[PDB]
Design a protein around this nucleic acid. Structure first.
Ligand SMILES: Nc1ccn([C@H]2C[C@H](O)[C@@H](COP(=O)(O)NP(=O)(O)OP(=O)(O)O)O2)c(=O)n1
Ligand SMILES: [Mn+2]
Ligand SMILES: [Mn+2]
Ligand code: NA
Ligand code: NA
Length: 326
DNA sequence: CCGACATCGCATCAGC
DNA sequence: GCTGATGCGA
DNA sequence: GTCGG
């Protein structure tokens, strides 16, 4: 649908979502507003009343009431007031820095630290992750053209197999869903000598190699199965590429497809699949799917030899990654 | 009137 | 020293 | 905030 049909309303709900998330520290209200904004974005009519939007799943009394005020007056006083509030705005803005959540943002603002310049004046008071998020603040909010994502994929696929021929690196996330641009790169790593039943430094060597060739530039978090960090394409003396976020995850190779499914997403989709499963007598996570039982006590896990397998167990139509936006 | 809305890895904090 | 809780994030 | 127990 043309976004201007109910663009005023979806914007309003999205702002409210971000504020509940970053300032009120209520993730479920953030999700509620998101859900209401999303479903309205699909509505192929121009909303005339709150009671009309009330019909859509995820729109209840409070939001329908807020829509009525917006249509009848062109704004939302609560949203107008929040926007002029120095404290709420600062807290909200600071959470745009990677590593800074609602708790840290609130405490920063409480001690007068409110801008990026304030943060730069106070490196002492930031932890390692936050410093990096601050350093590449602009870059991390840049979107990554798919062409560059392909360039980034080449490097990873190359260096991965260079360490050991039987690794299997799989770019998931928005990229796998075929998006024209991505927020970051998500790499899913698997190796034969690592199973659920089950060679140790399996993730570490790959990361080390990507640092070796100067592809990985910074580390946010690193462990046995999880990597969170920063990368950069090498420049062709023509100008330099932005620093990008990259997540790497080493997963039980015999659970490869539940992982590919989870880390391909989307965000709402993974959520809808798990919630559906429950209404239908199943429970999925990133590793297993397992039929809860009669009583709803999980039974044993199943074999899965392709993504479609999981789609079959609860039997939705196998939707291509491109289709899993919700 | 009121609880679910998923769960996890890693960094760091609170405390023994 | 350690375990467990919290924060932030995927 | 919304849905549904
Ligand atoms: N809260 C979250 C966060 C991430 N995820 C999963 C699904 C996402 O596809 C995946 C990766 O996170 P992600 O990189 O943040 N999003 P995703 O790659 O979809 O989109 P982008 O912003 O990168 O473009 O992990 C999730 O299921 N629930
Ligand atoms: Mn991503
Ligand atoms: Mn990611
Ligand atoms: Na409704
Ligand atoms: Na943040």
């Amino acid at each position: 649908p043309q976004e201007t049909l109910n663009g005023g309303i979806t914007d309003m709900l999205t702002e409210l979502a971000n504020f509940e998330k970053n300032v009120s520290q209520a993730i479920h209200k953030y999700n509620a507003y998101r859900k209401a904004a999303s479903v309205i974005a699909k509505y192929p009519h121009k909303i005339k009343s709150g009671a009309e939007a009330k019909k859509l799943p995820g729109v209840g009394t409070k939001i329908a009431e807020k829509i009525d005020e917006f249509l009848a007056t062109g704004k939302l006083r609560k949203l107008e007031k929040i926007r002029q509030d120095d404290t709420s705005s600062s807290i909200n803005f600071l959470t745009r820095v990677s590593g800074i959540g609602p708790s840290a943002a609130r405490k920063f603002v409480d001690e007068g630290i409110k801008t990026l310049e304030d943060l730069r004046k106070n490196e002492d008071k930031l932890n390692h992750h936050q410093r990096i998020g601050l350093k590449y603040f602009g870059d991390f909010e840049k979107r990554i053209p798919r062409e560059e994502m392909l360039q980034m994929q080449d490097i990873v696929l190359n260096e991965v197999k260079k360490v050991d021929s039987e690794y299997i690196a799989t770019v998931c996330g928005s990229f796998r869903r075929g998006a024209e641009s991505s927020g970051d790169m998500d790499v899913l790593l698997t190796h034969p000598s690592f199973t659920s039943e089950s060679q140790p430094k399996l993730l570490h060597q790959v990361v080390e190699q990507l640092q070796k060739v100067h592809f990985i530039t910074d580390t946010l978090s690193k462990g046995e199965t999880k990597f969170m960090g920063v990368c950069q394409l090498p420049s062709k003396d023509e100008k330099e590429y932005p620093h990008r976020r990259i997540d790497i995850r080493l997963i039980p190779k015999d659970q490869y497809y539940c992982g590919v499914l989870y880390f391909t997403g989307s965000d709402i989709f993974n959520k809808n699949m798990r919630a559906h499963a429950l209404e239908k007598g199943f429970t999925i996570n990133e590793y297993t799917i397992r039929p809860l039982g009669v009583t709803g006590v999980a039974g044993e896990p199943l074999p899965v030899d392709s993504e479609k397998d999981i789609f079959d167990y609860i039997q939705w139509k196998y939707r291509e990654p491109k289709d899993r936006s919700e």
